[PDB]
Design a protein around this ligand. Structure first.
Ligand SMILES: Nc1ncnc2c1ncn2[C@@H]1O[C@H](COP(=O)(O)OP(=O)(O)NP(=O)(O)O)[C@@H](O)[C@H]1O
Ligand SMILES: Nc1ncnc2c1ncn2[C@@H]1O[C@H](COP(=O)(O)OP(=O)(O)NP(=O)(O)O)[C@@H](O)[C@H]1O
Ligand SMILES: [K+]
Ligand SMILES: [K+]
Ligand SMILES: [Mg+2]
Ligand SMILES: [Mg+2]
Ligand code: NA
Ligand code: NA
Ligand code: NA
Ligand code: NA
Ligand code: NA
Ligand code: NA
Lengths: 394, 394
């Protein structure tokens, strides 16, 4: 109708249509760019960023312990006994801790001088936590003293010098902003799972988790490393072989350890990591591993006549069904996909991991006929049963 | 030995250990944050960023056509007939096009005034393309004239006014930097696949692709939209039902269209989108869809006695085996995971999509017993065959 008609022509698209966000404004306006979502997944990312920085001190050899506490007030506190965040004035004229807390693309991980091998690389993590917290407190033990700083809705207060101490390290306590997050209710089992991974990947490290909100205490320390991680993955799954396969390899700027064992189950349990970061969606290290494994198993099965010349090749899916594996890459110059680091991008890590897996898995299969035969049996007998059922579909 | 021993104690960790990168320096130093990798996946991301901006003009209703050309020199040229990038001086004192090409977190998509619904939201895309190109040229048709700008290793030259024209729009041509990328060899089929998706999702839009490097020409225009996308997905897969299921729903700040059809094959072919962006790793819209579908099929199968009361429930995997589906969400305030936008994060979109799918799929199953029975048969007979084979494993 005439009455319904409105003056609703679109606004002019000009220079003033283009807005520039300040750094921390960009985190608050577009948190998904940095943490994926403002749901449970993104809330936990705040813990990951702070714990990753403590783990980076451990990987450098300075930290031996990470203490994580979820306080009754919903704040998270992460303590390490590493070198401490510098508090001396930065060239920019603020305390160095204020630089990292308030500036994007600021940090000590843009070269290999401070951390040779680190999960950190963007200079963003702790600034995101500050941006998306109503409050952040830091206690740094350095240069013979305690140092205290706080951030009030991301804005620094005045650095305060405390008492004398010979200890060094960093404590970060943050209050996730309820105006950003749909929930601030951390999941203890989610946090325990990730801290357990970090301990399995760093067999010298101890991590302690305490939840004071009204199991509330775990200690994570696994001197048996990736082999014990696979034992843990297979604990509910019934191993179909007595051995855990474990090997490593080294190239210019990169190393890999792989542990793996097949079970009686129908799930793929392949966990991939770079510099302790959980690359949930995989990437070049997982692709190299998968390529090698499918090649070695098919070559072995055909050589040993376990696969008929007629029979189609075993697929990656056929082979990885019932596989538990951990792939841990150490890389001087990681390429991660985004701040959530879901994938390793390094093109050179694909051929490196593929090469080491090809060599080590070919050797293992050749040297272990009884176990190799059971694994090939599993992969075949499954594929064969799946096809016979599919052909009986009416 | 004594001779092997070196003065290799680590450098002091102080204020000068902390470096701040300029914006485009951060893209060149850490391209993975923005494009995932410097391999083939990241190279193609440069095309995606430029084409997404043209698609955003089409979604706003200003552009009708996107022309993509891969030149013999390895440059990519993207033309749209939208409003043009503003060239007038920005408040910051440079031409507005220079602001978007040189500054991170700068753009017209931080509110809904310029673009109501856009894949763009970070103000980063075109600055990444510039940062990772040795050269970028822009031709803007606006205000009665052609305007020309170039960027030389990301640095703007002087904006030049050209001839008169009543036309409006934007052409971007960029030369991917071979010092950043392991390969600059674009894959025609990779580009064709993505442009085809954009056309299926925007049934009024025409996209043309030309490859002049020494099939070299495609036109993408699909007035049949998501229904014709599903027809295309199932073309090699043998539909097991005569219908394509197609429905939509609307809520405050969001809409969804879903088209789906089951086939005789053993693959899941579910493609999910938000504001035309391909959310390859899914997210809240895919989770809502999956939850609804598993609920509706199990409820239907039990109500109709197609599943014995004894029988275990059909799993999501059982149900989605042989499923072709397209989920297209339109959202005023998208939350994407990272600049590669692999996942939709919006918590409210999960319950929205789940609600619409629950209502529309329950209705479709009830109204279409012959097709519903065949789909349940497929899901059961498969699961049943898979289990019988697994139990015959020795
Ligand atoms: N627990 C810590 N101990 C010592 N130094 C730390 C600690 N946490 C942060 N830092 C320093 O602060 C810098 C900034 O940290 P952060 O913002 O998390 O970025 P990053 O770790 O360098 N990279 P990323 O985490 O990938 O964004 C680090 O590079 C260190 O130099
Ligand atoms: N083809 C185009 N036509 C008109 N305006 C454009 C075009 N390309 C870019 N722009 C403008 O330039 C701004 C910056 O673009 P870009 O750097 O890609 O960021 P964005 O599209 O806003 N967000 P994102 O792509 O998610 O980083 C856009 O928001 C528009 O205002
Ligand atoms: K920082
Ligand atoms: K921009
Ligand atoms: Mg960090
Ligand atoms: Mg864009
Ligand atoms: Na009107
Ligand atoms: Na580094
Ligand atoms: Na210390
Ligand atoms: Na030495
Ligand atoms: Na917007
Ligand atoms: Na136009």
């Amino acid at each position: 109708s005439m009455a319904a008609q409105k003056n609703n022509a679109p606004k002019e698209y000009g220079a003033d249509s283009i807005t520039i966000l300040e750094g921390l404004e960009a985190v608050r306006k577009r948190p998904g760019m940095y943490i994926g979502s403002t749901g449970e997944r993104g809330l936990h990312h705040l813990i990951w960023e702070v714990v990753d920085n403590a783990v980076d001190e451990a990987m450098a050899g300075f930290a031996t312990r990470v203490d994580v506490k979820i306080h009754a007030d919903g704040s998270v506190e992460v303590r390490d006994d590493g070198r401490g965040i510098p508090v001396e004035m930065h060239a920019t004229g603020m305390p160095t801790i204020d630089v990292v807390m308030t500036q994007l693309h600021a940090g000590g991980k843009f070269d290999g001088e401070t951390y040779a091998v680190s999960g950190g690389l963007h200079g963003v993590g702790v600034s995101v936590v500050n941006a998306l917290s109503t409050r952040l407190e830091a206690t740094v033990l350095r240069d013979g003293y305690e140092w205290f700083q706080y951030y009030d809705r991301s804005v620094p207060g005045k650095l305060k010098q405390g008492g004398e101490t010979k200890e060094t390290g960093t404590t970060i306590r943050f209050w996730a902003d309820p105006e950003i997050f749909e929930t601030t209710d951390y999941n203890f089992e989610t946090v325990a799972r990730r801290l357990q991974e970090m301990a399995f990947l760093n067999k010298g490290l101890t991590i302690e988790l305490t939840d004071e909100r009204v199991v509330k205490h775990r200690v994570f320390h696994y001197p048996g490393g990736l082999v014990d991680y696979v034992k843990h993955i297979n604990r509910t799954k019934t191993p179909i072989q007595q051995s855990i396969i474990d090997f490593d390899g080294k190239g210019p700027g990169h190393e890999v350890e792989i542990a793996m064992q097949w079970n009686a189950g129908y799930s793929e349990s392949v966990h991939t990591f770079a510099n302790t970061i959980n690359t949930h969606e995989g990437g070049t290290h997982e692709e190299g591993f998968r390529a090698a494994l499918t090649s070695v198993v098919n070559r072995y099965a055909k050589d040993k006549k376990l696969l008929k010349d007629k029979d189609p090749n075993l697929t990656g899916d056929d082979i990885r069904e019932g596989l538990a594996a951990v792939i841990s890459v150490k890389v001087a110059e990681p390429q991660f996909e985004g701040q959530t680091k879901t994938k390793l991008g390094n093109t050179e890590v694909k051929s490196f991991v593929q090469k080491i897996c090809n060599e080590q898995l070919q050797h293992w299969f050749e040297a272990n006929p009884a176990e190799a035969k059971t694994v090939v049996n599993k992969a075949v007998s499954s594929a064969q049963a799946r096809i016979a059922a599919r052909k009986a579909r009416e």
